[PDB]
Paper text:
Cystic fibrosis, is a life-threatening autosomal recessive genetic disorder that originates from mutations in the [name] ([name]) gene.
For example [name] was observed in 3 different crystals: the ΔRI-[name]-T4 complex (diffracting up to 1.95 Å), the ΔRI-[name]-T8 complex (diffracting to 2.90 Å) and the ΔRI-[name]-[name] complex treated with papain (diffracting to 3.00 Å). [name] bound 2PT-[name] with a lower affinity (1.1 µM ± 0.1 µM), which is consistent with our determination of apparent affinity by ELISA. In contrast, [name] did not induce a significant shift in 2PT-[name] thermal stability. We noted that, while ATPase activity of [name] was not affected by the presence of [name], thermal inactivation was shifted by 3.1 °C in the presence of [name]. In contrast, the non-stabilizing [name] does not mediate long range connection, instead binding solely to a unique subdomain (SDR).
Numbering used by the authors:
A (entry chain P), B (entry chain T), E (entry chain C), F (entry chain Q): 1 to 123
C (entry chain N), D (entry chain M): 1 to 124
G (entry chain K): 1 to 121
H (entry chain O), I (entry chain L): 390 to 404, 437 to 636
J (entry chain A): 389 to 404, 437 to 636
K (entry chain F): 390 to 402, 438 to 542, 546 to 636
Write the structure that this text describes.
Amino acid sequence: QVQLQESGGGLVQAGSSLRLACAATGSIRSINNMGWYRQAPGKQRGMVAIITRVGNTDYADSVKGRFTISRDNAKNTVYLQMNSLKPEDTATYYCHAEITEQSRPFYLTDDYWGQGTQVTVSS
Amino acid sequence: QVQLQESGGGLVQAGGSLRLSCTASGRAFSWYVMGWFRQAPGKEREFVATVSGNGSRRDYADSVKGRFTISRDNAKNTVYLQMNSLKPEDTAVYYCAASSTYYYTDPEKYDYWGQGTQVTVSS
Amino acid sequence: QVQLQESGGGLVQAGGSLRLSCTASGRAFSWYVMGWFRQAPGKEREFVATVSGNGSRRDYADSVKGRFTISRDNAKNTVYLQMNSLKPEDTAVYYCAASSTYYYTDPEKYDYWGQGTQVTVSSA
Amino acid sequence: QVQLQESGGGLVQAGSSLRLACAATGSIRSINNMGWYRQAPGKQRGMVAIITRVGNTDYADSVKGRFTISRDNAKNTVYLQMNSLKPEDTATYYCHAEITEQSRPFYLTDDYWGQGTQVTVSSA
Amino acid sequence: QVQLQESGGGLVQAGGSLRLSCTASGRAFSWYVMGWFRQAPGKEREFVATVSGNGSRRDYADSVKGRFTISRDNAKNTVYLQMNSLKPEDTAVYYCAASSTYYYTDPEKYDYWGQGTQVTVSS
Amino acid sequence: QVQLQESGGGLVQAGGSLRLSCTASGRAFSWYVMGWFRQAPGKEREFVATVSGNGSRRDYADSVKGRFTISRDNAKNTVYLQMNSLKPEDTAVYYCAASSTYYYTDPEKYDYWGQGTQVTVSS
Amino acid sequence: QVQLQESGGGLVQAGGSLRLSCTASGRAFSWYVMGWFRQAPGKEREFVATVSGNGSRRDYADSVKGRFTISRDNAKNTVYLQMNSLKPEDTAVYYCAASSTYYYTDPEKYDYWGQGTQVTV
Amino acid sequence: TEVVMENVTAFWEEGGTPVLKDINFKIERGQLLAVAGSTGAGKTSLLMMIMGELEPSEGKIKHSGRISFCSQFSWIMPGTIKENIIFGVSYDEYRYRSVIKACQLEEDISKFAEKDNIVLGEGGITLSGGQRARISLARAVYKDADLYLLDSPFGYLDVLTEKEIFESCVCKLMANKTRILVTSKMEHLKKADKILILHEGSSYFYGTFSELQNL
Amino acid sequence: TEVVMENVTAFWEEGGTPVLKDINFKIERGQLLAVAGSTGAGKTSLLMMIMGELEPSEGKIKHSGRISFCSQFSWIMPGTIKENIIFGVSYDEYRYRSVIKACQLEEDISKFAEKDNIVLGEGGITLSGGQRARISLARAVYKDADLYLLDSPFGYLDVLTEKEIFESCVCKLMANKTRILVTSKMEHLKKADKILILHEGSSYFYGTFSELQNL
Amino acid sequence: TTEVVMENVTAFWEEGGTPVLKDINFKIERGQLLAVAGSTGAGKTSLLMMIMGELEPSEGKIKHSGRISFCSQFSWIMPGTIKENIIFGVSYDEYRYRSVIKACQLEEDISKFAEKDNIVLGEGGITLSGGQRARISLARAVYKDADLYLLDSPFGYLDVLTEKEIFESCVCKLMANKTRILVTSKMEHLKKADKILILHEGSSYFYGTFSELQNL
Amino acid sequence: TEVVMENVTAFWETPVLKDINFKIERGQLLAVAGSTGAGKTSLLMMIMGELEPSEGKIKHSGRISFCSQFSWIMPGTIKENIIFGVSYDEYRYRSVIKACQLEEDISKFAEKDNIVLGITLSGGQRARISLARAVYKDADLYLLDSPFGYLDVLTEKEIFESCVCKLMANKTRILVTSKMEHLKKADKILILHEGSSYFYGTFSELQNL
Ligand SMILES: Nc1ncnc2c1ncn2[C@@H]1O[C@H](COP(=O)(O)OP(=O)(O)OP(=O)(O)O)[C@@H](O)[C@H]1O
Ligand SMILES: Nc1ncnc2c1ncn2[C@@H]1O[C@H](COP(=O)(O)OP(=O)(O)OP(=O)(O)O)[C@@H](O)[C@H]1O
Ligand SMILES: Nc1ncnc2c1ncn2[C@@H]1O[C@H](COP(=O)(O)OP(=O)(O)OP(=O)(O)O)[C@@H](O)[C@H]1O
Ligand SMILES: Nc1ncnc2c1ncn2[C@@H]1O[C@H](COP(=O)(O)OP(=O)(O)OP(=O)(O)O)[C@@H](O)[C@H]1O
Ligand SMILES: OC[C@H]1O[C@](CO)(O[C@H]2O[C@H](CO)[C@@H](O)[C@H](O)[C@H]2O)[C@@H](O)[C@@H]1O
Ligand SMILES: OC[C@H]1O[C@](CO)(O[C@H]2O[C@H](CO)[C@@H](O)[C@H](O)[C@H]2O)[C@@H](O)[C@@H]1O
Ligand SMILES: OC[C@H]1O[C@](CO)(O[C@H]2O[C@H](CO)[C@@H](O)[C@H](O)[C@H]2O)[C@@H](O)[C@@H]1O
Ligand SMILES: [Mg+2]
Ligand SMILES: [Mg+2]
Ligand SMILES: [Mg+2]
Ligand SMILES: [Mg+2]
Ligand SMILES: [Mg+2]
Ligand SMILES: [Mg+2]
Ligand SMILES: [Mg+2]
């Protein structure tokens, strides 16, 4: 009933721009928090950027100022604008969302994750 | 280490005028070289105008020279772009960017970028 | 003591959405109670929404309740106004103001004001 | 009973000096914390300078260093020496005193006020 | 250290009144317990009144009790002695002294002294 | 970052005593959990003794318990190892190491290391 | 003002080499003129080598000249003495000392001293 | 019994709409109460009432005075990280370093050369929202109290850090203390002893997780 | 029955004159006790006793440990205004800003460009006596305690500010909290629940304002 | 102003390991001084850690009235002035402050500075001696108004002359009516104790009065 | 014969200055006017030596004090900023402050000149402190590049009259200004347009065009 679908990934040159998008589809009553996470090979999954329903954003030190997280509450979509890409940014980007299903009796959330999008930055 | 947000975009008839603003959130704004860049439909991000930390050095793209003016306010952490006598050619997403290195007009030298603002010039 | 600059205004069709921003330049942003005010053509400045320095307190005009949302980012010295489901009544110049005194929704208690942004909601 | 009588006011040029005096008369056992206050037209009454019985003085930021409050405990009089007058000092000057009437069985005070003194500072 | 200077002495009619002042020059004036001491012709320095650094503690010689009042202004680095209903017995050189140790009335505990002021009373 | 330098090593007869020192050059010495480690030739680095930043916690290897004592001087940025009643088994290169993570005795948790000092127990 | 601790001493065959270290614990290390001093059994403390706070001035005893080298690391609050081509004459307790006074090689001008390290050649 | 509220109603403004309407709950010693609800439901206001910052117009509130409160809105005082965590509380290395570990602060603190001696400004502008939130929670959990009021501490935290903090701090470090956690996450609600769901000042649900599951 | 004193006598020096002689009073929860008297009567000493700094030689004192004391003599620590007010206590904006308002500090604080983030030295030599006194009172009323001991706080304040502070802080903000006020003002005494008049360590009067009026 | 009770208390720092404290029993009446003696590693600090709740007992029961002020074995100084370090978020009272300083042998040291108690501590301002640091730490603990005072080896880095003055005027005179637990192995201190607990390898080797200890 | 320029031309990377000629006598005021980008600042850089001429020769005495178009303030006190590295003389200091309209602003502060800067001043306050620093330095030649740019016309009038004209009266000064009000008081005037000298002469000669 609820699915998260990431898009926008691919192979880019260093310094390139890229816009990842992740939309929540299905029986959605509401979404509270949304975020972009990444996992490079061998390394563990970590946060990139997070966004509150109202639009307050937090960033990883490594991406702050270069990357921008935004959301369209009407479209139930979170976006990651990735600028001045570096080879270190190479990873699988995951989308997270705290979703309240239409079936849910009260305004209680559940953690949903995307399948991931591969972003590869070449030198 | 700087978060940039542009404003002032929109629709205008040819021969018209528009003023873009860009506020920077972060430390040592005076260290950065600020620049305005535009990305046309299908084309790469092209340099429009740049201003040094001090405001002592201003450089413009040949196409915009004599019509566009770049200004800075280090006390207000903002950079402006006054776009006079607009042509339909100027239709693009205008980005505001910061560079931590002295005097380069190539967008590859700019690490921090804003979300951008659409500017559309009709007739 | 604080210089304010609004952005995000423009033309929109009814039922639409618009997000206004306001950046403050000056010391102790967190001390100020920020507010959004609208001045309709011919009418006085009316209160729209307010936010306490902390962001702990948010108050809205009865007319905008449930459609407008006020938010704050003290790290970015900005205050925002998300205007959803717009009606032609909301056509006015939206001002962003700062108050050095605690919890008032009356514009008379706000000392620092911005230039304002025109917001036009077409019935069409 | 007890009365407070101000004197020394008037119309002066800017930069001029002036000495206001206020004496407590009647059945007074003791006086505590006398002070001077001022009220400009339309505006509310506020402090100028205060003095404890022991002689500790406090001043309004606007008058600190220019004005001097003093007291003669023998004469039960408070004085306001007003130097380098500015047109901003134009107001009605009131004298206050925490007085213990002889009639009182305990060392308890009551707030007494003067009638007021008009001080007007002209630019010319 | 603190440098002390007294003022306010002179000739007075019996039952009279005189106010002595003492300004201190130096750091941490609030640390010092201030005291007024009198040296009668031929006699030793006798304690008159003392003030704690805070001002919270005030002690007086039995002879002066109810007639003399000791006060302090830490912002003005001053200590005062209001001498009411003076008697010919009070004729002495009044000294102002500072003690770096908490709560003693004996002049032996006071390290810093002023020059003194002569105060004469005639019946 | 902290730079560590050990001293006090050398040759001693069995039943003897030796005191090793280790000075740390860098900021926030008190944050680090200091440890003494010994590397027997053709043997893995073994934990000897550890001391918390405060000095409140001291732990020793079972083999050295009751004979070795670990001490700290945060004012002098040094850690010491008093090795009493030495056996020929204690012949190894003694290393000094710092850990930025609280309370582990495993050398894998220690990021900063010294050059080491050879300790030889004869007879 | 400064607490000094030497290390690096021991036994060596003639013609050999040894490097002594001395770490200082205290404020304003750069103000001090550091020096290495030796005291042979039966003899007084003799000057060996000195370094100005900056490291700009280095002076050596005639006996050690060309064989010994004095160095400093103000960031590590350390002074070193590289003793090359050692002779049996160099057998003594080597002390590291700090002087708050500019440019003296007389151990009488050095106020702060270390424990010392025995060097045998 | 540690915290009890019986028929409690309160107003922020006299003659207005009550912020909390007929609130009932009993939290036993060492239990975890989860307070869920929509934005503006009155969750913070309920905690304020426990603090005494909100006086009830009707009803009764009972508890032991030892309370440690963690705000929805992180606050940083000028001074070092250590100064901010031990806010006038006696220093114990073991407790300090254990709290840091539990609140996912060790890695961040060790990134700095000066470690916990790094100087912060007011509002922690130099730190990230997550770093600020972690320091605020650390300060609150460092304080030894009988009751811990944690108002939406994970609001500006990523789901990975929040998972670690909830498990090792809220559940492990504070295991036998009475805790009131303002959260609307099912992941957190499953571990709660009792759950209070508020909507427009009113109690829409009060009971166990199994009772909530059966709806 | 918040504060109770029974046949209490105490001495500062053994064998000397008792600073307080046979003191009796019972202050009910949330009441205002006014402590009046001549200079040297033993008023501060009575508060010192409630604080535990003075041990009674004879008699008994009963109260709940939560006490917040406001000194006659203002003290300001090095740091910002906010640092001085909130002190050891945690930060709550409503409580902070309400206390500033009540203590007549908002206008003074807003006069500074840095507002509450303005750095004060020790003793607040930059500030006026009144500003110092207001910051000290603000700090005391910001501490959440069961009992408030306010020893002559209005001493270095102008009569207009004192009137505003007494009415909006002592009477309105602290209305439901038991508080002891050392004051010799009739204006303050009229609003007291009970009045204790001390003279040379002895209780000369104890009762209501109406009872005092009938003398 | 508290009662401290321990009944058959045993605790472990590590699961399944050796108990740090084995069958601990004691009752400290209001305003009494308990001396906790023992060899290094006996479990003295660990016993205080238990009173503070940092150590949970596996078996037994502990009772006390909260409001506890703890003085660490290891002195700690916060960035700021001497006054800032002693008062530490506790309301300022001149009499209490200046009395605590006198008792803790700090007046002479503080008055040696031109800025007195307003001297800035830490690396930024000044470096104090081990004794000065220990005195400031004890002063801070005794300045805090609590019902129970846990003083873990405060005289550790102090000279015998200062320690004698501090013990007599602070621990015995200034805090005379407050319940105190003092971790000390000195007879000089033990003679003035109400009750004495001697620990050795987690176990209670002695518990009783000074006269009972004297009769051994 | 303090400052001389002969057929001077230079390039930053079109030449920024093309065949520049002028002779400024001792104690004279040269006004340098022109459109934005004309090469005025660049001409001053050449006098400094920060810009090397490709052709021509420049002659002057080494004692130069330069006031930038762009105000800069160092982290210390006001006094620290004005005095900079120069020895302190009360008379000179207090005279410079009076002339540069700073006394009133400084006296508005409780700490006066001991106030610590990064307090953020107004553009005007910043400009006045920068000019004060430049005029406090005792040099033979004063290069003042558009100092009145962010100043109100009333303050600018006071500063020009009491500082540029009265305080530095017998010193050689080169003032970059495009104001007629300033040009009337100039000894000689140089007008630049796109690197070229469009006018060089007296005010009367300029008036006759
Ligand atoms: N201090 C206050 N004074 C007056 N009204 C307040 C105050 N705090 C909150 N309110 C109002 O009372 C209501 C209760 O909101 P509250 O702050 O409890 O929100 P919450 O739902 O508990 O937390 P959140 O909204 O962040 O989820 C809101 O409508 C708010 O405007
Ligand atoms: N800390 C102290 N130690 C010893 N004696 C003290 C102390 N404080 C006060 N005293 C003595 O006991 C008496 C009590 O005076 P106290 O200050 O309590 O009266 P008061 O009503 O507070 O006077 P005031 O109105 O001046 O404050 C004083 O005369 C003083 O000498
Ligand atoms: N926080 C802790 N976590 C784990 N083990 C600990 C902890 N604190 C102490 N220990 C262990 O328990 C014993 C320490 O007991 P403790 O330090 O309380 O004795 P002590 O009497 O205080 O010693 P000292 O006289 O040296 O202070 C040692 O085995 C030590 O390793
Ligand atoms: N440091 C520099 N490096 C390279 N080019 C520069 C430099 N400074 C200025 N320029 C360029 O040289 C031209 C001359 O600008 P300049 O600043 O000298 O004009 P000006 O006469 O000072 O008038 P204005 O002060 O209004 O600029 C400008 O178009 C600019 O782009
Ligand atoms: O590392 C575990 C940690 O938890 C204990 C448990 O008693 O103490 C905590 O107690 C409260 C919870 O009620 C925490 O807020 C406090 O910070 C902890 O000290 C103890 O073993 C350890 O400190
Ligand atoms: O100078 C004596 C001292 O004793 C009093 C009286 O109780 O208070 C002390 O008691 C507490 C312990 O409860 C100490 O910690 C505190 O520092 C002391 O003040 C008081 O008269 C005096 O200060
Ligand atoms: O009061 C006049 C003022 O002029 C002197 C020199 O004559 O000082 C200035 O020196 C030159 C001008 O001659 C200036 O460049 C410098 O700014 C001034 O300080 C001296 O009398 C007085 O200070
Ligand atoms: Mg809330
Ligand atoms: Mg504190
Ligand atoms: Mg008193
Ligand atoms: Mg111990
Ligand atoms: Mg501080
Ligand atoms: Mg220029
Ligand atoms: Mg310099």
